[PDB]
PDB file of C-alpha atoms in Angstrom:
ATOM      1  CA  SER F   1      37.502  -0.036 -82.367  1.00  0.00           C
ATOM      2  CA  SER F   2      39.961  -2.623 -83.698  1.00  0.00           C
ATOM      3  CA  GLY F   3      40.254  -5.806 -81.642  1.00  0.00           C
ATOM      4  CA  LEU F   4      43.350  -7.410 -80.131  1.00  0.00           C
ATOM      5  CA  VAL F   5      43.386  -9.608 -83.248  1.00  0.00           C
ATOM      6  CA  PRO F   6      43.661  -7.480 -86.452  1.00  0.00           C
ATOM      7  CA  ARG F   7      41.423  -7.626 -89.540  1.00  0.00           C
ATOM      8  CA  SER F   8      17.102  -1.615 -99.099  1.00  0.00           C
ATOM      9  CA  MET F   9      17.241  -4.817 -97.054  1.00  0.00           C
ATOM     10  CA  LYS F  10      20.527  -6.599 -96.396  1.00  0.00           C
ATOM     11  CA  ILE F  11      20.794 -10.371 -96.250  1.00  0.00           C
ATOM     12  CA  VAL F  12      22.123 -12.100 -93.132  1.00  0.00           C
ATOM     13  CA  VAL F  13      23.575 -15.552 -93.743  1.00  0.00           C
ATOM     14  CA  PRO F  14      24.008 -17.769 -90.673  1.00  0.00           C
ATOM     15  CA  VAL F  15      26.983 -20.098 -90.375  1.00  0.00           C
ATOM     16  CA  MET F  16      26.993 -22.928 -87.860  1.00  0.00           C
ATOM     17  CA  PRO F  17      30.301 -24.801 -87.895  1.00  0.00           C
ATOM     18  CA  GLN F  18      30.542 -27.453 -85.172  1.00  0.00           C
ATOM     19  CA  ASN F  19      34.342 -27.432 -85.029  1.00  0.00           C
ATOM     20  CA  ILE F  20      37.422 -25.613 -86.294  1.00  0.00           C
ATOM     21  CA  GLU F  21      37.767 -27.837 -89.373  1.00  0.00           C
ATOM     22  CA  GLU F  22      34.212 -27.041 -90.464  1.00  0.00           C
ATOM     23  CA  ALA F  23      34.879 -23.368 -89.776  1.00  0.00           C
ATOM     24  CA  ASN F  24      37.877 -23.348 -92.113  1.00  0.00           C
ATOM     25  CA  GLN F  25      35.826 -25.205 -94.745  1.00  0.00           C
ATOM     26  CA  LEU F  26      33.031 -22.634 -94.920  1.00  0.00           C
ATOM     27  CA  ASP F  27      32.397 -21.769 -98.563  1.00  0.00           C
ATOM     28  CA  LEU F  28      32.485 -18.057 -99.431  1.00  0.00           C
ATOM     29  CA  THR F  29      31.618 -18.741-103.077  1.00  0.00           C
ATOM     30  CA  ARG F  30      27.900 -17.947-102.708  1.00  0.00           C
ATOM     31  CA  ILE F  31      28.305 -14.990-100.336  1.00  0.00           C
ATOM     32  CA  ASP F  32      28.604 -11.462-101.694  1.00  0.00           C
ATOM     33  CA  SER F  33      30.331  -8.467-100.092  1.00  0.00           C
ATOM     34  CA  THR F  34      27.094  -6.908 -98.853  1.00  0.00           C
ATOM     35  CA  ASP F  35      25.864 -10.016 -97.045  1.00  0.00           C
ATOM     36  CA  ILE F  36      26.140  -9.981 -93.273  1.00  0.00           C
ATOM     37  CA  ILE F  37      27.495 -13.176 -91.715  1.00  0.00           C
ATOM     38  CA  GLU F  38      25.879 -14.448 -88.520  1.00  0.00           C
ATOM     39  CA  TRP F  39      28.143 -16.745 -86.549  1.00  0.00           C
ATOM     40  CA  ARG F  40      25.869 -19.040 -84.570  1.00  0.00           C
ATOM     41  CA  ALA F  41      28.466 -19.861 -81.932  1.00  0.00           C
ATOM     42  CA  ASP F  42      25.903 -21.786 -79.858  1.00  0.00           C
ATOM     43  CA  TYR F  43      26.492 -24.701 -82.241  1.00  0.00           C
ATOM     44  CA  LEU F  44      29.708 -25.199 -80.270  1.00  0.00           C
ATOM     45  CA  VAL F  45      30.318 -26.397 -76.725  1.00  0.00           C
ATOM     46  CA  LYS F  46      31.377 -23.607 -74.365  1.00  0.00           C
ATOM     47  CA  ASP F  47      35.058 -24.583 -74.317  1.00  0.00           C
ATOM     48  CA  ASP F  48      35.352 -24.528 -78.124  1.00  0.00           C
ATOM     49  CA  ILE F  49      34.042 -21.026 -78.792  1.00  0.00           C
ATOM     50  CA  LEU F  50      37.308 -19.153 -78.251  1.00  0.00           C
ATOM     51  CA  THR F  51      39.298 -21.811 -80.113  1.00  0.00           C
ATOM     52  CA  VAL F  52      37.090 -21.571 -83.224  1.00  0.00           C
ATOM     53  CA  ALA F  53      36.767 -17.770 -83.171  1.00  0.00           C
ATOM     54  CA  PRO F  54      40.113 -17.021 -84.865  1.00  0.00           C
ATOM     55  CA  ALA F  55      39.086 -19.117 -87.893  1.00  0.00           C
ATOM     56  CA  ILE F  56      35.669 -17.486 -88.099  1.00  0.00           C
ATOM     57  CA  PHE F  57      37.085 -13.986 -88.074  1.00  0.00           C
ATOM     58  CA  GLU F  58      39.865 -14.773 -90.520  1.00  0.00           C
ATOM     59  CA  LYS F  59      37.417 -16.478 -92.880  1.00  0.00           C
ATOM     60  CA  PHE F  60      34.953 -13.592 -92.812  1.00  0.00           C
ATOM     61  CA  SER F  61      37.323 -10.658 -92.837  1.00  0.00           C
ATOM     62  CA  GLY F  62      35.797  -8.117 -95.196  1.00  0.00           C
ATOM     63  CA  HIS F  63      32.285  -9.079 -94.138  1.00  0.00           C
ATOM     64  CA  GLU F  64      30.163  -7.603 -91.376  1.00  0.00           C
ATOM     65  CA  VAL F  65      29.768 -10.228 -88.676  1.00  0.00           C
ATOM     66  CA  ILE F  66      27.148 -10.858 -85.994  1.00  0.00           C
ATOM     67  CA  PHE F  67      28.306 -12.881 -82.976  1.00  0.00           C
ATOM     68  CA  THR F  68      25.342 -14.929 -81.736  1.00  0.00           C
ATOM     69  CA  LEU F  69      24.921 -17.130 -78.686  1.00  0.00           C
ATOM     70  CA  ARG F  70      21.370 -18.422 -79.139  1.00  0.00           C
ATOM     71  CA  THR F  71      20.264 -20.266 -75.996  1.00  0.00           C
ATOM     72  CA  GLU F  72      18.130 -23.381 -75.648  1.00  0.00           C
ATOM     73  CA  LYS F  73      15.321 -21.257 -74.207  1.00  0.00           C
ATOM     74  CA  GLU F  74      14.980 -19.610 -77.627  1.00  0.00           C
ATOM     75  CA  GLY F  75      15.669 -22.391 -80.112  1.00  0.00           C
ATOM     76  CA  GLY F  76      19.440 -22.342 -79.700  1.00  0.00           C
ATOM     77  CA  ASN F  77      21.961 -25.050 -78.901  1.00  0.00           C
ATOM     78  CA  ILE F  78      23.707 -23.818 -75.747  1.00  0.00           C
ATOM     79  CA  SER F  79      22.920 -23.029 -72.117  1.00  0.00           C
ATOM     80  CA  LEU F  80      25.098 -20.546 -70.236  1.00  0.00           C
ATOM     81  CA  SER F  81      25.077 -18.905 -66.825  1.00  0.00           C
ATOM     82  CA  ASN F  82      24.925 -15.116 -66.650  1.00  0.00           C
ATOM     83  CA  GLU F  83      28.642 -15.079 -65.850  1.00  0.00           C
ATOM     84  CA  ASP F  84      29.737 -17.306 -68.731  1.00  0.00           C
ATOM     85  CA  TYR F  85      27.455 -15.573 -71.217  1.00  0.00           C
ATOM     86  CA  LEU F  86      28.909 -12.174 -70.321  1.00  0.00           C
ATOM     87  CA  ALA F  87      32.494 -13.466 -70.253  1.00  0.00           C
ATOM     88  CA  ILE F  88      32.312 -14.980 -73.719  1.00  0.00           C
ATOM     89  CA  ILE F  89      30.638 -11.932 -75.227  1.00  0.00           C
ATOM     90  CA  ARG F  90      33.125  -9.553 -73.602  1.00  0.00           C
ATOM     91  CA  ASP F  91      36.170 -11.574 -74.662  1.00  0.00           C
ATOM     92  CA  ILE F  92      34.930 -11.946 -78.243  1.00  0.00           C
ATOM     93  CA  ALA F  93      34.229  -8.200 -78.314  1.00  0.00           C
ATOM     94  CA  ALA F  94      37.709  -7.363 -76.990  1.00  0.00           C
ATOM     95  CA  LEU F  95      39.521  -9.864 -79.210  1.00  0.00           C
ATOM     96  CA  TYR F  96      37.723  -9.607 -82.533  1.00  0.00           C
ATOM     97  CA  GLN F  97      35.325  -6.664 -82.347  1.00  0.00           C
ATOM     98  CA  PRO F  98      32.382  -8.174 -84.258  1.00  0.00           C
ATOM     99  CA  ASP F  99      30.211  -5.580 -85.996  1.00  0.00           C
ATOM    100  CA  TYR F 100      27.204  -6.724 -83.957  1.00  0.00           C
ATOM    101  CA  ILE F 101      26.634  -8.701 -80.778  1.00  0.00           C
ATOM    102  CA  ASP F 102      23.404 -10.595 -80.159  1.00  0.00           C
ATOM    103  CA  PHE F 103      21.951 -10.195 -76.672  1.00  0.00           C
ATOM    104  CA  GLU F 104      19.076 -12.542 -75.846  1.00  0.00           C
ATOM    105  CA  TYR F 105      17.010 -10.013 -73.917  1.00  0.00           C
ATOM    106  CA  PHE F 106      14.564 -12.083 -71.870  1.00  0.00           C
ATOM    107  CA  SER F 107      17.141 -14.768 -71.140  1.00  0.00           C
ATOM    108  CA  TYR F 108      19.623 -12.259 -69.706  1.00  0.00           C
ATOM    109  CA  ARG F 109      17.632  -9.115 -68.870  1.00  0.00           C
ATOM    110  CA  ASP F 110      19.038  -8.994 -65.337  1.00  0.00           C
ATOM    111  CA  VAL F 111      22.609  -8.463 -66.514  1.00  0.00           C
ATOM    112  CA  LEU F 112      21.880  -6.197 -69.490  1.00  0.00           C
ATOM    113  CA  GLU F 113      23.028  -3.297 -67.303  1.00  0.00           C
ATOM    114  CA  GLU F 114      26.559  -4.718 -67.347  1.00  0.00           C
ATOM    115  CA  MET F 115      26.608  -4.092 -71.100  1.00  0.00           C
ATOM    116  CA  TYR F 116      26.101  -0.335 -70.719  1.00  0.00           C
ATOM    117  CA  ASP F 117      29.232   0.428 -72.756  1.00  0.00           C
ATOM    118  CA  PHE F 118      28.129  -1.568 -75.817  1.00  0.00           C
ATOM    119  CA  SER F 119      26.628   0.328 -78.756  1.00  0.00           C
ATOM    120  CA  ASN F 120      26.404  -2.560 -81.229  1.00  0.00           C
ATOM    121  CA  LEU F 121      23.876  -4.769 -79.466  1.00  0.00           C
ATOM    122  CA  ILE F 122      21.074  -6.642 -81.137  1.00  0.00           C
ATOM    123  CA  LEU F 123      18.419  -7.022 -78.454  1.00  0.00           C
ATOM    124  CA  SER F 124      16.715 -10.181 -79.623  1.00  0.00           C
ATOM    125  CA  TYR F 125      13.631 -12.211 -78.776  1.00  0.00           C
ATOM    126  CA  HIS F 126      12.491 -15.494 -80.334  1.00  0.00           C
ATOM    127  CA  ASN F 127       9.220 -17.306 -79.682  1.00  0.00           C
ATOM    128  CA  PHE F 128       8.975 -20.685 -81.400  1.00  0.00           C
ATOM    129  CA  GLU F 129       5.574 -21.582 -79.969  1.00  0.00           C
ATOM    130  CA  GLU F 130       3.338 -18.598 -80.692  1.00  0.00           C
ATOM    131  CA  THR F 131       2.989 -14.916 -81.460  1.00  0.00           C
ATOM    132  CA  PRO F 132       2.383 -13.448 -77.984  1.00  0.00           C
ATOM    133  CA  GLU F 133      -0.679 -11.293 -77.264  1.00  0.00           C
ATOM    134  CA  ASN F 134       1.582  -8.573 -75.893  1.00  0.00           C
ATOM    135  CA  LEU F 135       3.804  -8.420 -78.974  1.00  0.00           C
ATOM    136  CA  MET F 136       3.298  -4.655 -79.102  1.00  0.00           C
ATOM    137  CA  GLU F 137       4.684  -4.399 -75.557  1.00  0.00           C
ATOM    138  CA  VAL F 138       7.757  -6.386 -76.557  1.00  0.00           C
ATOM    139  CA  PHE F 139       8.428  -3.971 -79.413  1.00  0.00           C
ATOM    140  CA  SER F 140       7.941  -1.075 -77.000  1.00  0.00           C
ATOM    141  CA  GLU F 141      10.207  -2.460 -74.280  1.00  0.00           C
ATOM    142  CA  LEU F 142      13.144  -3.275 -76.564  1.00  0.00           C
ATOM    143  CA  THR F 143      12.769   0.026 -78.418  1.00  0.00           C
ATOM    144  CA  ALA F 144      12.930   2.030 -75.189  1.00  0.00           C
ATOM    145  CA  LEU F 145      16.408   0.597 -74.549  1.00  0.00           C
ATOM    146  CA  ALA F 146      17.480   1.942 -77.948  1.00  0.00           C
ATOM    147  CA  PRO F 147      19.856  -0.878 -78.932  1.00  0.00           C
ATOM    148  CA  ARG F 148      21.694  -0.862 -82.265  1.00  0.00           C
ATOM    149  CA  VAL F 149      19.059  -3.329 -83.478  1.00  0.00           C
ATOM    150  CA  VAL F 150      15.751  -4.555 -82.117  1.00  0.00           C
ATOM    151  CA  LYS F 151      15.275  -8.115 -83.327  1.00  0.00           C
ATOM    152  CA  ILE F 152      11.977  -9.920 -82.934  1.00  0.00           C
ATOM    153  CA  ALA F 153      11.170 -13.355 -84.356  1.00  0.00           C
ATOM    154  CA  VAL F 154       7.852 -15.078 -83.673  1.00  0.00           C
ATOM    155  CA  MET F 155       5.926 -18.195 -84.701  1.00  0.00           C
ATOM    156  CA  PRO F 156       2.510 -17.717 -86.344  1.00  0.00           C
ATOM    157  CA  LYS F 157      -0.441 -19.974 -85.581  1.00  0.00           C
ATOM    158  CA  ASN F 158      -2.580 -18.360 -88.288  1.00  0.00           C
ATOM    159  CA  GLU F 159      -2.355 -15.840 -91.120  1.00  0.00           C
ATOM    160  CA  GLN F 160      -3.337 -12.893 -88.941  1.00  0.00           C
ATOM    161  CA  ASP F 161      -0.312 -13.572 -86.680  1.00  0.00           C
ATOM    162  CA  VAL F 162       1.936 -13.057 -89.696  1.00  0.00           C
ATOM    163  CA  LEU F 163       0.212  -9.827 -90.661  1.00  0.00           C
ATOM    164  CA  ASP F 164       0.414  -8.646 -87.049  1.00  0.00           C
ATOM    165  CA  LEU F 165       4.203  -9.106 -86.965  1.00  0.00           C
ATOM    166  CA  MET F 166       4.451  -7.218 -90.261  1.00  0.00           C
ATOM    167  CA  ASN F 167       2.126  -4.437 -89.121  1.00  0.00           C
ATOM    168  CA  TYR F 168       3.831  -3.925 -85.753  1.00  0.00           C
ATOM    169  CA  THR F 169       7.184  -3.648 -87.503  1.00  0.00           C
ATOM    170  CA  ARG F 170       6.074  -0.875 -89.858  1.00  0.00           C
ATOM    171  CA  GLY F 171       4.129   0.811 -87.061  1.00  0.00           C
ATOM    172  CA  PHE F 172       7.158   0.936 -84.789  1.00  0.00           C
ATOM    173  CA  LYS F 173       9.466   1.972 -87.647  1.00  0.00           C
ATOM    174  CA  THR F 174       7.094   4.844 -88.393  1.00  0.00           C
ATOM    175  CA  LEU F 175       7.124   5.887 -84.730  1.00  0.00           C
ATOM    176  CA  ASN F 176      10.879   5.320 -84.468  1.00  0.00           C
ATOM    177  CA  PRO F 177      12.518   6.008 -87.839  1.00  0.00           C
ATOM    178  CA  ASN F 178      16.040   6.065 -86.388  1.00  0.00           C
ATOM    179  CA  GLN F 179      15.612   2.692 -84.697  1.00  0.00           C
ATOM    180  CA  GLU F 180      16.739  -0.302 -86.734  1.00  0.00           C
ATOM    181  CA  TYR F 181      14.396  -3.272 -86.597  1.00  0.00           C
ATOM    182  CA  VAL F 182      14.974  -6.798 -87.808  1.00  0.00           C
ATOM    183  CA  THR F 183      11.840  -8.880 -87.606  1.00  0.00           C
ATOM    184  CA  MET F 184      10.284 -12.045 -88.976  1.00  0.00           C
ATOM    185  CA  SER F 185       7.334 -14.354 -88.646  1.00  0.00           C
ATOM    186  CA  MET F 186       8.867 -17.821 -88.753  1.00  0.00           C
ATOM    187  CA  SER F 187       7.857 -21.018 -90.602  1.00  0.00           C
ATOM    188  CA  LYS F 188       6.497 -21.540 -94.117  1.00  0.00           C
ATOM    189  CA  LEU F 189       3.350 -19.734 -92.977  1.00  0.00           C
ATOM    190  CA  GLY F 190       5.364 -16.608 -92.171  1.00  0.00           C
ATOM    191  CA  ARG F 191       7.565 -16.521 -95.284  1.00  0.00           C
ATOM    192  CA  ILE F 192       5.976 -13.381 -96.764  1.00  0.00           C
ATOM    193  CA  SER F 193       7.236 -11.458 -93.724  1.00  0.00           C
ATOM    194  CA  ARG F 194      10.780 -12.338 -94.820  1.00  0.00           C
ATOM    195  CA  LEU F 195      10.273 -11.329 -98.455  1.00  0.00           C
ATOM    196  CA  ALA F 196       8.638  -8.122 -97.247  1.00  0.00           C
ATOM    197  CA  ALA F 197      11.570  -6.746 -95.224  1.00  0.00           C
ATOM    198  CA  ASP F 198      11.653  -3.447 -97.141  1.00  0.00           C
ATOM    199  CA  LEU F 199       7.895  -2.955 -96.955  1.00  0.00           C
ATOM    200  CA  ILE F 200       7.684  -3.603 -93.229  1.00  0.00           C
ATOM    201  CA  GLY F 201      10.794  -1.696 -92.126  1.00  0.00           C
ATOM    202  CA  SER F 202      13.072  -4.616 -91.304  1.00  0.00           C
ATOM    203  CA  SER F 203      16.667  -3.685 -92.125  1.00  0.00           C
ATOM    204  CA  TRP F 204      17.763  -7.293 -92.608  1.00  0.00           C
ATOM    205  CA  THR F 205      16.403 -10.586 -93.819  1.00  0.00           C
ATOM    206  CA  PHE F 206      17.807 -14.010 -92.887  1.00  0.00           C
ATOM    207  CA  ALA F 207      18.578 -16.385 -95.738  1.00  0.00           C
ATOM    208  CA  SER F 208      19.981 -19.905 -95.619  1.00  0.00           C
ATOM    209  CA  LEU F 209      23.177 -21.089 -97.289  1.00  0.00           C
ATOM    210  CA  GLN F 210      12.887 -20.976 -94.631  1.00  0.00           C
ATOM    211  CA  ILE F 211      14.299 -19.516 -97.855  1.00  0.00           C
ATOM    212  CA  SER F 212      17.670 -19.768 -99.605  1.00  0.00           C
ATOM    213  CA  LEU F 213      20.161 -17.009-100.340  1.00  0.00           C
ATOM    214  CA  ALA F 214      19.714 -17.821-104.026  1.00  0.00           C
ATOM    215  CA  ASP F 215      15.945 -17.302-104.006  1.00  0.00           C
ATOM    216  CA  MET F 216      16.166 -14.278-101.713  1.00  0.00           C
ATOM    217  CA  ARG F 217      18.441 -12.460-104.154  1.00  0.00           C
ATOM    218  CA  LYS F 218      16.082 -13.294-107.020  1.00  0.00           C
ATOM    219  CA  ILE F 219      13.036 -12.022-105.158  1.00  0.00           C
ATOM    220  CA  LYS F 220      14.937  -8.887-104.167  1.00  0.00           C
ATOM    221  CA  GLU F 221      15.426  -8.306-107.900  1.00  0.00           C
ATOM    222  CA  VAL F 222      11.711  -8.809-108.560  1.00  0.00           C
ATOM    223  CA  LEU F 223      10.757  -6.346-105.839  1.00  0.00           C
ATOM    224  CA  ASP F 224      13.376  -3.738-106.798  1.00  0.00           C
ATOM    225  CA  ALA F 225      12.696  -3.661-110.542  1.00  0.00           C
ATOM    226  CA  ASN F 226      11.180  -0.556-112.152  1.00  0.00           C
TER     227      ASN F 226
END
Protein backbone atom coordinates (compact mmCIF):
# COMPACT_ATOMS: atom_id res chain seq x y z
CA SER A 1 0.00 0.00 0.00
CA SER A 2 1.69 3.18 1.25
CA GLY A 3 5.30 3.64 0.15
CA LEU A 4 8.40 4.23 2.28
CA VAL A 5 7.86 7.93 1.53
CA PRO A 6 4.40 9.11 2.76
CA ARG A 7 1.74 10.99 0.76
CA SER A 8 -16.57 8.66 -18.68
CA MET A 9 -13.01 9.11 -19.92
CA LYS A 10 -10.29 10.49 -17.67
CA ILE A 11 -7.54 12.75 -18.96
CA VAL A 12 -3.88 11.78 -18.55
CA VAL A 13 -1.46 14.70 -18.60
CA PRO A 14 2.20 13.84 -19.21
CA VAL A 15 4.96 15.76 -17.45
CA MET A 16 8.53 15.59 -18.68
CA PRO A 17 10.87 17.56 -16.41
CA GLN A 18 14.54 17.18 -17.36
CA ASN A 19 15.86 17.98 -13.89
CA ILE A 20 14.80 18.56 -10.29
CA GLU A 21 14.41 22.33 -10.77
CA GLU A 22 11.99 21.81 -13.66
CA ALA A 23 10.16 19.21 -11.58
CA ASN A 24 9.59 21.68 -8.75
CA GLN A 25 8.46 24.30 -11.28
CA LEU A 26 5.68 22.19 -12.79
CA ASP A 27 2.49 24.26 -12.89
CA LEU A 28 -0.57 22.67 -11.27
CA THR A 29 -2.78 25.62 -12.21
CA ARG A 30 -4.30 23.96 -15.30
CA ILE A 31 -4.62 20.47 -13.82
CA ASP A 32 -7.81 19.41 -12.07
CA SER A 33 -8.23 16.79 -9.33
CA THR A 34 -9.54 14.12 -11.70
CA ASP A 35 -6.64 14.36 -14.15
CA ILE A 36 -4.10 11.56 -14.02
CA ILE A 37 -0.47 12.66 -14.13
CA GLU A 38 1.97 10.64 -16.24
CA TRP A 39 5.56 11.10 -15.17
CA ARG A 40 7.68 10.46 -18.25
CA ALA A 41 10.82 9.60 -16.30
CA ASP A 42 12.65 8.59 -19.50
CA TYR A 43 13.26 12.31 -20.05
CA LEU A 44 15.94 11.91 -17.39
CA VAL A 45 19.28 10.11 -17.44
CA LYS A 46 19.28 6.88 -15.43
CA ASP A 47 21.18 8.33 -12.46
CA ASP A 48 18.74 11.24 -12.04
CA ILE A 49 15.49 9.29 -11.79
CA LEU A 50 15.64 8.53 -8.07
CA THR A 51 16.88 12.03 -7.26
CA VAL A 52 13.96 13.70 -9.07
CA ALA A 53 11.30 11.26 -7.83
CA PRO A 54 10.77 12.89 -4.41
CA ALA A 55 9.88 16.20 -6.08
CA ILE A 56 7.51 14.54 -8.54
CA PHE A 57 5.61 12.72 -5.83
CA GLU A 58 5.45 15.72 -3.52
CA LYS A 59 4.26 17.95 -6.36
CA PHE A 60 1.54 15.54 -7.45
CA SER A 61 0.30 14.34 -4.09
CA GLY A 62 -3.47 14.20 -4.37
CA HIS A 63 -3.27 13.14 -8.01
CA GLU A 64 -3.16 9.65 -9.45
CA VAL A 65 0.27 9.12 -10.97
CA ILE A 66 1.60 6.85 -13.71
CA PHE A 67 5.33 6.09 -13.58
CA THR A 68 6.57 5.69 -17.17
CA LEU A 69 9.93 4.63 -18.55
CA ARG A 70 9.35 4.90 -22.30
CA THR A 71 12.30 3.39 -24.17
CA GLU A 72 13.95 4.52 -27.39
CA LYS A 73 12.53 1.46 -29.15
CA GLU A 74 9.05 2.95 -28.67
CA GLY A 75 9.54 6.69 -29.08
CA GLY A 76 11.01 7.25 -25.63
CA ASN A 77 14.20 8.92 -24.45
CA ILE A 78 16.01 6.21 -22.47
CA SER A 79 17.59 2.80 -23.00
CA LEU A 80 17.85 0.39 -20.07
CA SER A 81 18.96 -3.19 -19.55
CA ASN A 82 16.45 -5.68 -18.16
CA GLU A 83 18.17 -5.41 -14.78
CA ASP A 84 18.15 -1.61 -14.58
CA TYR A 85 14.59 -1.34 -15.87
CA LEU A 86 13.34 -3.74 -13.20
CA ALA A 87 15.44 -2.14 -10.45
CA ILE A 88 14.14 1.35 -11.10
CA ILE A 89 10.53 0.22 -11.34
CA ARG A 90 10.79 -1.85 -8.17
CA ASP A 91 12.47 0.92 -6.17
CA ILE A 92 9.97 3.54 -7.32
CA ALA A 93 7.14 1.14 -6.44
CA ALA A 94 8.58 0.47 -2.97
CA LEU A 95 9.42 4.11 -2.25
CA TYR A 96 6.48 6.02 -3.67
CA GLN A 97 3.81 3.51 -4.67
CA PRO A 98 2.62 5.16 -7.91
CA ASP A 99 -0.99 4.36 -8.78
CA TYR A 100 0.14 2.80 -12.06
CA ILE A 101 3.38 1.47 -13.50
CA ASP A 102 4.02 1.38 -17.24
CA PHE A 103 5.56 -1.84 -18.53
CA GLU A 104 6.75 -1.72 -22.13
CA TYR A 105 5.62 -5.22 -23.07
CA PHE A 106 7.57 -6.09 -26.21
CA SER A 107 10.72 -4.38 -24.97
CA TYR A 108 10.77 -6.40 -21.74
CA ARG A 109 8.52 -9.43 -22.31
CA ASP A 110 11.22 -11.83 -21.11
CA VAL A 111 11.25 -10.40 -17.59
CA LEU A 112 7.52 -9.72 -17.23
CA GLU A 113 7.36 -12.86 -15.08
CA GLU A 114 9.45 -11.11 -12.43
CA MET A 115 6.58 -8.65 -12.00
CA TYR A 116 4.11 -11.35 -10.95
CA ASP A 117 3.28 -9.53 -7.71
CA PHE A 118 2.27 -6.27 -9.42
CA SER A 119 -1.44 -5.57 -9.92
CA ASN A 120 -1.17 -1.99 -11.20
CA LEU A 121 0.66 -2.58 -14.47
CA ILE A 122 -0.08 -0.86 -17.73
CA LEU A 123 1.07 -3.29 -20.40
CA SER A 124 1.90 -0.89 -23.20
CA TYR A 125 2.83 -1.03 -26.87
CA HIS A 126 3.66 1.87 -29.18
CA ASN A 127 4.25 1.70 -32.93
CA PHE A 128 5.35 5.00 -34.46
CA GLU A 129 5.78 3.65 -37.98
CA GLU A 130 2.55 1.83 -38.79
CA THR A 131 -0.58 0.08 -37.59
CA PRO A 132 0.50 -3.59 -37.67
CA GLU A 133 -1.49 -6.18 -39.62
CA ASN A 134 -1.70 -8.33 -36.51
CA LEU A 135 -3.10 -5.57 -34.30
CA MET A 136 -5.91 -7.89 -33.24
CA GLU A 137 -3.31 -10.39 -31.99
CA VAL A 138 -1.61 -7.68 -29.96
CA PHE A 139 -4.90 -6.84 -28.26
CA SER A 140 -5.45 -10.54 -27.62
CA GLU A 141 -1.98 -11.20 -26.21
CA LEU A 142 -1.96 -8.27 -23.77
CA THR A 143 -5.55 -8.98 -22.71
CA ALA A 144 -4.74 -12.60 -21.87
CA LEU A 145 -2.21 -11.37 -19.30
CA ALA A 146 -5.00 -9.37 -17.65
CA PRO A 147 -2.95 -6.33 -16.59
CA ARG A 148 -4.55 -3.39 -14.78
CA VAL A 149 -4.53 -1.60 -18.14
CA VAL A 150 -3.88 -2.68 -21.71
CA LYS A 151 -2.41 0.30 -23.54
CA ILE A 152 -2.00 0.31 -27.30
CA ALA A 153 -0.86 3.28 -29.38
CA VAL A 154 -0.33 3.02 -33.13
CA MET A 155 0.49 5.23 -36.12
CA PRO A 156 -2.03 5.36 -38.99
CA LYS A 157 -0.96 5.45 -42.63
CA ASN A 158 -4.53 5.99 -43.83
CA GLU A 159 -8.03 6.64 -42.50
CA GLN A 160 -8.93 2.96 -42.28
CA ASP A 161 -6.00 2.40 -39.88
CA VAL A 162 -7.59 4.90 -37.51
CA LEU A 163 -10.98 3.24 -37.74
CA ASP A 164 -9.35 -0.16 -37.20
CA LEU A 165 -7.74 0.97 -33.93
CA MET A 166 -11.11 2.37 -32.82
CA ASN A 167 -13.01 -0.75 -33.86
CA TYR A 168 -10.59 -3.19 -32.22
CA THR A 169 -10.83 -1.24 -28.98
CA ARG A 170 -14.63 -1.42 -28.79
CA GLY A 171 -14.58 -5.03 -29.98
CA PHE A 172 -12.18 -6.09 -27.24
CA LYS A 173 -14.00 -4.01 -24.61
CA THR A 174 -17.22 -5.77 -25.59
CA LEU A 175 -15.52 -9.16 -25.27
CA ASN A 176 -13.74 -8.11 -22.08
CA PRO A 177 -15.88 -5.59 -20.18
CA ASN A 178 -13.81 -5.87 -16.99
CA GLN A 179 -10.55 -5.19 -18.81
CA GLU A 180 -9.48 -1.55 -18.92
CA TYR A 181 -8.13 -0.41 -22.27
CA VAL A 182 -6.34 2.80 -23.13
CA THR A 183 -5.82 3.16 -26.84
CA MET A 184 -5.07 5.75 -29.49
CA SER A 185 -4.25 6.20 -33.14
CA MET A 186 -1.46 8.77 -33.14
CA SER A 187 -0.83 11.87 -35.29
CA LYS A 188 -3.22 14.51 -36.62
CA LEU A 189 -4.73 11.79 -38.80
CA GLY A 190 -5.67 9.76 -35.72
CA ARG A 191 -7.05 12.59 -33.57
CA ILE A 192 -10.68 11.40 -33.69
CA SER A 193 -9.58 8.24 -31.87
CA ARG A 194 -8.54 10.46 -28.95
CA LEU A 195 -11.78 12.46 -28.88
CA ALA A 196 -13.70 9.20 -29.11
CA ALA A 197 -12.35 7.54 -25.95
CA ASP A 198 -15.83 6.99 -24.47
CA LEU A 199 -17.27 5.64 -27.71
CA ILE A 200 -14.46 3.18 -28.30
CA GLY A 201 -14.01 1.93 -24.72
CA SER A 202 -10.74 3.64 -23.86
CA SER A 203 -10.74 4.56 -20.16
CA TRP A 204 -8.24 7.39 -20.61
CA THR A 205 -7.24 9.99 -23.14
CA PHE A 206 -3.84 11.72 -23.28
CA ALA A 207 -3.84 15.50 -23.43
CA SER A 208 -0.91 17.90 -23.58
CA LEU A 209 -0.15 20.66 -21.08
CA GLN A 210 -1.85 16.10 -30.53
CA ILE A 211 -4.50 17.98 -28.54
CA SER A 212 -4.37 20.27 -25.49
CA LEU A 213 -5.91 19.74 -22.08
CA ALA A 214 -7.92 22.91 -22.68
CA ASP A 215 -9.50 21.66 -25.91
CA MET A 216 -9.98 18.14 -24.57
CA ARG A 217 -12.07 19.42 -21.67
CA LYS A 218 -14.16 21.52 -24.06
CA ILE A 219 -14.80 18.61 -26.39
CA LYS A 220 -15.66 16.40 -23.42
CA GLU A 221 -18.34 18.98 -22.61
CA VAL A 222 -19.65 18.89 -26.18
CA LEU A 223 -19.85 15.10 -26.15
CA ASP A 224 -21.40 14.87 -22.67
CA ALA A 225 -24.13 17.48 -23.12
CA ASN A 226 -27.79 16.43 -23.19
